[PDB]
Amino acid sequence: EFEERVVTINRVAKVVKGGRRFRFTALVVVGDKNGRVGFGTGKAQEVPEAIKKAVEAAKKDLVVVPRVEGTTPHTITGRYGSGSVFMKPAAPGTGVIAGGPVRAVLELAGITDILSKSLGSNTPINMVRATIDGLQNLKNAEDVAKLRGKTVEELY
Amino acid sequence: PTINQLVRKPRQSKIKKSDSPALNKGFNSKKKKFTDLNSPQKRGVCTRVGTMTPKKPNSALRKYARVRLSNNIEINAYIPGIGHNLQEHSVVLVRGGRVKDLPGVRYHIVRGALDTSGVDGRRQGRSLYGTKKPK
Amino acid sequence: TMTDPIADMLTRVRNANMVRHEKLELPASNIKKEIAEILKSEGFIKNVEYVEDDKQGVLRLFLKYGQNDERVITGLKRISKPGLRVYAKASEMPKVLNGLGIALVSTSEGVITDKEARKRNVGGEIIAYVW
Amino acid sequence: NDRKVYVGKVVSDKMDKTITVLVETYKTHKLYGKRVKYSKKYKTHDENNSAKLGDIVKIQETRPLSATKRFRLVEIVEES
Amino acid sequence: AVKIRLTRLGSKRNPFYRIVVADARSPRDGRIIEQIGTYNPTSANAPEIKVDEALALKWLNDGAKPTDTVHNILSKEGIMKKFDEQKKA
Amino acid sequence: RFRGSNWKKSRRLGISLSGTGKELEKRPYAPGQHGPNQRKKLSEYGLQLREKQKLRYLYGMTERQFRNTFDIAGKKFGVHGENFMILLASRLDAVVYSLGLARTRRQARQLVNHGHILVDGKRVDIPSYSVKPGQTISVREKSQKLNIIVESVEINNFVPEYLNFDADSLTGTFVRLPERSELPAEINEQLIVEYYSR
RNA sequence: CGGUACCUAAUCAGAAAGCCACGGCUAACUACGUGCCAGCAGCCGCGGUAAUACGUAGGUGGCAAGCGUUAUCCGGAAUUAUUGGGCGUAAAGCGCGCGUAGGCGGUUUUUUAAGUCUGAUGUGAAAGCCCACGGCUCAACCGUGGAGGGUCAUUGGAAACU
RNA sequence: UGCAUUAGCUAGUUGGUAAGGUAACGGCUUACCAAGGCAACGAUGCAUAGCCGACCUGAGAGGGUGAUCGGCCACACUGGA
């Protein structure tokens, strides 16, 4: 189930010699609670198509987040442009404490044991990019030991 | 920087110039000096009482007063409320609290405390403006 | 007039790791060859090879990757420098990427690694958080 | 018992039996952890003008024989 | 001189003395020489006498004196009764 | 504490467990003046505030009684959202309502403060005293019967999990502490823990 | 202190909460004046005769003997950025130098154990500070038991790197 | 603690030489000898402030309060004996 989360409504006014438009764009985050997470937007007007074309746009790319279960396996961060996020793994019995673009990809993957020091910008585009571009750069233990050519259980 | 020259010159922090400079100052009356003890409200006495025009395009005449504090600093203090007992020479109490869209005047006048009573005809802002709770 | 040998040597690896190289080398010392041994002791590369030349001969790297045209060496950074020589305690020594990297340890016990100093009960001069 | 028996190396022997050795070591900024060299000369009494120029003099503290003379001589190694 | 006393604790109208053998020149809650034991006589039944009598053998033999209320719980609990043979040396 | 009449309280909050139910008489959307309108929600930050409001108003205490137990829920290193409830379930507030000593809790939480309930022996005047499980939660023998004391014992049996009872002057035992499955889903206990995170 | 606290009985359902908004931030709205006036005003701002924003009044709301204002230190805030900041056009290179001090320096071997990092203890402070009980009607508020320093000293050492 | 919009600081000073005298030490003072000693690592001077434990909030890196509550220092109209 491609779990939806909206960010905002919008209005854009292109002042010309004539008249300005009433485009109502948006941007959403679409995860699945499995470690296969996307996000999407669209220059739309319809609040359904603000979801629908963007849910279609998020289903242009669901990124593969490797999840050693129970939390996010490492103490990680994010990076895009002028913004950057941060995640520290923690206990399960906490209650998730994060924000708007830093909680979004973190809650639609079912992990719930993390931190959030959302550094960088306040523009949610490159923020939720950094929430995604950091998270896509995650790696597990078993594939890297395959990639390095050691064994999996040799790493502790 | 370098951590070498950070020993040679440390990260000295930044100061913060605090608002309301007339409320964190006393007066050594014996030696004509000044103390700094940060009162909530320092009392004073009115010298002039008038009003002022907001230069921002909101339009009113908001009433202010030229008050001299205990430490004899002359201010321009906003007199909130509608009616008052502030003709002249009222020995009043003065808070901080800036009124925006009004240059220079950044102090309130504590209603109903020192020598004024508060305003009368209020029924939604009763705890302020000197009105005791009815019945 | 370079000051950190083990960092410019380490960033030259990442200098060609970006453009997907499979073969580079580095100069030698008493340390830096044996430092390059601890990489291929874990075996992150195919094999680091022999020192040949007159003074600090080139010892190869042979960068070993994944089958999806990938790279294994994510993150390459010496932490110490001339001006800041940093050390580690064995009792609160961390894990690089929470158990997905390595962190080597340098003292007069022989230049050891994260596994080779957690059960050695010595710390030392830590260098690389390479994951 | 004993007294403190620190070391040094001379800088200026003053007129009539006052040598001045130099001690220096490495203190840190605890905010930074980076240590830095720093010096603290502790002036010793030379009993018989024993120490010379270049001498890495090990001395030993006493109670004040004079205003500055807190330390007395035990060990002298070389000279330039 | 140096002497055993009654240095108290506890909330309002409720004392918790831990005994202290120290000088008379200090205040009653001042800096001490030795906090030996506690004594809470104010209970419903007990005096709650906890005593490590090993150090009364030292101090009462070279300068410390029991003084007029700390003397006679030692004659009650038997702290100085063991000292009665230890002073009989 | 609260000190109300719960007939409108079943309609006001999420739920507050008045009796069998009180919403079916009038329109149960809202009590009045603005309800059947553009029905607006509030935030998840306000939903956990509302989920706090479905349990602060349910248990009837104030803050720093529902809030100062939350830091001792940080002393017990289990699930913070439910180990908070098991210490909240371990007091004398479960007695004056659940085991029937009145038609509500208010007439019976009066009855402990007179010294007419007298749990664990002589007298415990206060309900903030946690019922440390094992003490004989008793009844004063000089107040054995009323119009309220033995009446709702017959109405409401099943004194809840890890609190037994009797008709031997209506005395209990409170043999252990009940878990989160002995905590009702009338208000979701997991969604209080993040309003106290904020 | 004090016959104060406490226990018995009698007693009436007895004699007791206040305050700011109801604009968007933020859950709590509507009518009378009102006509940029009175006035509110944390930022954006309301009032020009149809104000939800002012002022007048019922609901509620946040939570209880407080509520609100005022001023004062900290987090929020990595706007002092060791951790964790920039110097082309945004604030950050003098007009360039040369140069005194200072800082920091290529490469490869061997000595010390000084610096590093460990191991035997003593071992770091009383309300403050780890963990678990005891005392408080709960509790407010006071003790217990090691933990104990895992930082400093008395002590043994190890040389890649300084 | 900070100021170089405080840089040159000291001359019984700076070392020693003899008397004191102190529970002891010596430039501590007195007769002698050289200008030495102190310094940009900011001596000197200015301005400000009892110190510490302790408080307090900070992820840690910690640093701000002292009514508190303890330990030490200084004071008792002022200034000397």
How close B15 comes to chain D (CA, Å)?
A: 20
Method: cryo-EM
Query: In this structure, are strands C59-60 and B77-78 parallel, antiparallel, or unpaired?
Result: unpaired
With CA atoms as reference, report the closest residue to F87 among F98, F75, F99. F75
Tell me the resolution in Å. Answer: 2.4
The verdict on a CB contact (< 8 Å) between C43 and A139 is no
Amino acid at D76: I
Identify the three-state secondary structure at position C26: strand
Distance CA E65, CA F167 (A): 64
With CA atoms as reference, report the closest residue to C30 among C2, C8, C51. C51
Chain F neighbours (≥3 Cβ pairs under 8 A) are A
Whether the CB of D12 is less than 7 Å away from nucleic strand H comes out as yes
Query: In this structure, are strands A86-87 and B42-52 parallel, antiparallel, or unpaired?
Result: unpaired
Mutate to test the interface with A, among F45, F47, F75, F80 (most CBs of A within 10 A): F80
Is A97 in the F-facing interface, judged by CB distances under 8 Å?
A: yes
Tokens at E3, concatenated: 């002497």
With CA atoms as reference, report the closest residue to F7 among F141, F80, F103. F103
Mutate to test the interface with B, among D29, D30, D37, D38 (most CBs of B within 10 A): D29
Our measurement of CA C87 to C1' H59, in angstroms, reads: 22
Is F60 in the A-facing interface, judged by CB distances under 8 Å?
A: no
Q: Which residues pair with residue A6 across a beta bridge? A: A28
Distance CA B21, CA B43 (A): 15
Backbone angles phi, psi at C128, to 5 degrees: -120, 130
Distance CA F160, CA A33 (A): 37
- Contact list in A for residue C99 (CB cut-off 8 A) is 73-74, 141, 155-156
Is C74 in the A-facing interface, judged by CB distances under 8 Å?
A: yes
User: Protein footprint on strand G: which nucleotides are under 7 Å from a CB?
Assistant: 1, 7-9, 13, 18-22, 26-30, 36-47, 55-73, 77-82, 85-87, 103-110, 115-119, 131-132, 135-143, 150, 158-161
Residue A56 vs residues A4, A10, A34, A59: alpha-carbon distances, Å: 12, 19, 19, 5
Is A96 in the F-facing interface, judged by CB distances under 8 Å?
A: yes
CA angle E78, E84, E86 (to 5 degrees): 115
Find out whether F178 and F190 touch, Cβ atoms under 8 Å.
Answer: no
Amino acid at B93: L
Distance CA C126, CA C114 (A): 9
Q: What are the residues whose beta carbons fall under 8 Å from the beta carbon of A105, sequence distance 6 or more?
A: A29, A31, A37, A39, A128, A131, A132, A135
Q: How far is CA C40 from the centre of its chain?
A: 9
How close A132 comes to chain C (CA, Å)?
A: 18
Identify the three-state secondary structure at position F87: helix
Distance CA D25, CA B78 (A): 63
With CA atoms as reference, report the closest residue to F119 among F82, F174, F74, F78. F174
Sheet holding B93-94, edge to edge: B77-78, B62-69, B42-52, B93-94
Please report, to the nearest 10 degrees, the dihedral formed by the alpha carbons of residues D43, D46, D51, D55 taken in order: -20
With CA atoms as reference, report the closest residue to D45 among D15, D61, D69, D67. D69
Distance CA A143, CA A113 (A): 23
Tokens at C71, concatenated: 């790279």
Distance CA F132, CA E69 (A): 41
The conformation of residue B132, written as its DSSP 8-state character, comes to P
Find out whether D44 and D17 touch, Cβ atoms under 8 Å.
Answer: no
Whether the CB of F122 is less than 7 Å away from nucleic strand G comes out as no
Between residue 106 and residue 125 of chain B, the positions with Cβ below 7 Å from nucleic chain G are 108, 121-125
Distance CA E37, CA E21 (A): 10
Chain E neighbours (≥3 Cβ pairs under 8 A) are none
DSSP notation for chain A: --EEEE-----B----SS----B--EEEEEE-SSSEEEEEEE--S-HHHHHHHHHHHHTT-EEE----TTS-SS-EE--BTTBB-EE----STT-----SSTTHHHHSSS--------BS-S-HHHHHHHHHHHHHT---SHHHHHHHTS-SGGG-
Residue F153 vs residues C43, D12, D60: alpha-carbon distances, Å: 74, 100, 90
Whether the CB of D26 is less than 7 Å away from nucleic strand G comes out as yes
B51: part of which helix (H) or strand (E)?
Answer: strand B42-52
Mutate to test the interface with A, among C68, C72, C116, C131 (most CBs of A within 10 A): C72
> Long-range pairs for B60-69 at CB < 8 Å and ≥24 separation?
B62/B99, B62/B102, B64/B102, B64/B105, B65/B92, B65/B109, B67/B92, B67/B94, B67/B107, B67/B109, B68/B44, B69/B22, B69/B42, B69/B43, B69/B44, B69/B94
Find out whether A58 and A29 touch, Cβ atoms under 8 Å.
Answer: yes
Identify the three-state secondary structure at position B104: coil
Find which nucleotide's C1' atom is closest to B126's CA: G19
Q: Which residues pair with residue A51 across a beta bridge? A: none
